[PDB]
Amino acid sequence: GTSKLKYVLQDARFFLIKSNNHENVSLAKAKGVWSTLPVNEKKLNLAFRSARSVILIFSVRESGKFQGFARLSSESHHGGSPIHWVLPAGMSAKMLGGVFKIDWICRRELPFTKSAHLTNPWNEHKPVKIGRDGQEIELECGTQLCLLFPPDESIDLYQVIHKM
Numbered sequence: 603g604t605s606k607l608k609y610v611l612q613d614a615r616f617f618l619i620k621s622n623n624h625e626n627v628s629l630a631k632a633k634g635v636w637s638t639l640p641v642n643e644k645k646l647n648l649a650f651r652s653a654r655s656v657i658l659i660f661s662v663r664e665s666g667k668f669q670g671f672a673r674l675s676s677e678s679h680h681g682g683s684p685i686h687w688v689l690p691a692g693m694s695a696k697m698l699g700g701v702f703k704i705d706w707i708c709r710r711e712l713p714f715t716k717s718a719h720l721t722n723p724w725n726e727h728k729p730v731k732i733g734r735d736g737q738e739i740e741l742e743c744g745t746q747l748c749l750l751f752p753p754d755e756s757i758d759l760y761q762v763i764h765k766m
């Protein structure tokens with residue numbers, strides 16, 4: 603069902619994550635971690651204290667799809683382990699240094715063609731697929747976007763609800 607999902611999404615904040623490559627999203631799904639650039643890291647750390655749930659919605663650049671969504675379970679932390687990210691051309695390894703722990707809510711894909719009816723007030727009402735890494739998605743648009751994803755029956759939201 604969708605009832606526990608709706609409960610997790612209640613009064614949540616939503617951020618669009620854009621990854622340059624599929625490998626880091628795969629690593630994030632395997633290890634329950636994410637790292638971003640310092641500007642976005644500060645925003646997510648602020649949001650984590652501000653909201654009952656902070657939801658990251660992932661899209662790999664050029665894929666035409668979202669790859670899933672996850673909830674922050676921690677602020678960023680250093681020195682736990684050097685996650686073997688694949689660095690973009692130019693991107694150093696100290697720029698992706700802060701590691702957030704995340705709990706996946708859905709590891710299924712959603713093509714952009716299915717979200718074409720959703721616009722983001724915080725990005726000039728452009729379609730929600732449009733946005734830079736870290737773009738905040740307003741509550742109503744982000745809730746409907748998450749509800750569009752196919753159900754991920756491999757995930758049990760009971761433990762996610764307890765961390766709230």
Ligand SMILES: CNc1nc(Cl)nc2c1ncn2Cc1ccc(C(=O)O)cc1
Nearest residue numbers: 620621622623626637638639687690735
């Ligand atoms: C493990 N975390 C990550 N992995 C990958 Cl592959 N891309 C990420 C990412 N977090 C953000 N992005 C996209 C991005 C946006 C701007 C620049 C730049 O201004 O150079 C570089 C990358």
